[PDB]
């Protein structure tokens, strides 16, 4: 196993070198709108939409995230949007969505990612109710490796939740969103994230570091295994009080190993939280709840998945909602050119 972890260290050193190369010289304008056939709208957001499209020459299906530059600026999301694209075009890991193309025009920013028809973990989790612990652990293991990877690049993730995780056709996870991801060596202070997933030190407006991602992993494992998150209420303010309280109630069916893992991840004191101790991520990888987990095998996608969303065709949209279909507006005049020069 000790040879396995010298291997892990050499891998991360190689990945940091490769990431910094693409990080320091990002790809730009690697396709254009006319290259795709629009099929259907898969989601809407305050400053854009996601569309299922098909590459004309290739025939491959893609999720195309289209952001209105004017609204990005209005809602003060410039830094987040430039970061999402710069990060995605530079990272390379099995459980991250794959950015294939990006480009911009007078009005919009476009990011084009391989289409995952299974959709979001969120809807499967809510329909099924909860996942069994082996099922939950298979997903968790992939987030653990993914955070090891991102953290080795000094990237804090800050956006973990079932909404931002896809289940692909082999039943493995793809992490979707990087708008809140930031390269940070020590602490940062932006109040961002989702109420249910916020670590106590975020809520308390003290600086915080990568330990907030290990907190969020605890929330995610809990929500997956229980069917509801550990801290919920009618209003966000009531959630925050529960989070900082230091108390969590576990369902009666949670194993003793799972409870002990979660107490160490949902540790309100970040200096005592697993993932942030001397041994770092190994305290998690070496915890008894993960004794049966073949980390090498997970990375290699060799473990058989406990759930494969029904294969209904590579352009199926059944796992996404229906939205009113609207034109993609492109002005005859360039908008916000300076804000998005690096895109």
């Amino acid at each position: 196993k000790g040879s396995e972890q010298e291997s892990v260290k050499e891998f991360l050193a190689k990945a940091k070198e490769e990431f910094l190369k693409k990080w320091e010289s990002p790809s730009q304008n690697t396709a254009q709108l006319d290259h795709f056939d629009r099929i259907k709208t898969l989601g809407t957001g305050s400053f854009g939409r996601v569309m299922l499209v098909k590459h004309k020459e290739t025939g491959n299906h893609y999720a195309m995230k289209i952001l209105d530059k004017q609204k990005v600026v209005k809602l003060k999301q410039i830094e987040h949007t430039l970061n999402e694209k710069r990060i995605l075009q530079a990272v390379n890991f099995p459980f991250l969505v794959k950015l294939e193309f990006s480009f911009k025009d007078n009005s919009n920013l476009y990011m084009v990612m391989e289409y995952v028809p299974g959709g979001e973990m969120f809807s499967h989790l809510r329909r099924i109710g909860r996942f069994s612990e082996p099922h939950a652990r298979f997903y968790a293991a992939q987030i653990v490796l993914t955070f090891e990877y991102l953290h080795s690049l000094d990237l804090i993730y800050r956006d973990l939740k079932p909404e931002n995780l896809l289940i692909d056709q082999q039943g493995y996870i793809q992490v979707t969103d990087f708008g809140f991801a930031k390269r940070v060596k020590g602490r940062t202070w932006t109040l961002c994230g989702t109420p249910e997933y916020l670590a106590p030190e975020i809520i308390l407006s003290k600086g915080y570091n990568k330990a907030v991602d290990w907190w969020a992993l605890g929330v995610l494992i809990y929500e997956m295994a229980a069917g509801y998150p550990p801290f919920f209420a009618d209003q966000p303010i009531q959630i925050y009080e529960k989070i900082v309280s230091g108390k969590v109630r576990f369902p009666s069916h949670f194993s003793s190993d799972l409870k002990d893992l979660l107490r160490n991840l949902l540790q309100v004191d970040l200096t005592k939280r697993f993932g942030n101790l001397k041994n770092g991520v190994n305290d998690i990888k070496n915890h008894k709840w993960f004794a049966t987990t073949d980390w090498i095998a997970i990375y290699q996608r060799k473990v058989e998945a406990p759930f494969i969303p029904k294969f209904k065709g590579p352009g199926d949209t059944s796992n996404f909602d229906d939205y009113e279909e609207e034109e993609i507006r492109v002005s005859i005049n360039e908008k916000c050119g300076k804000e998005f020069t690096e895109f």
């Binding site: 809140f180 994230g193 919920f232």
Partner: peptide
């Protein structure tokens, strides 16, 4: 049950950042 309380909280749908 706690799940019933959850399916009563109004926070069972996709959760926005904030």
């Amino acid at each position: 049950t706690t799940y019933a309380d959850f399916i009563a909280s109004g926070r069972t749908s996709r959760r926005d950042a904030i």
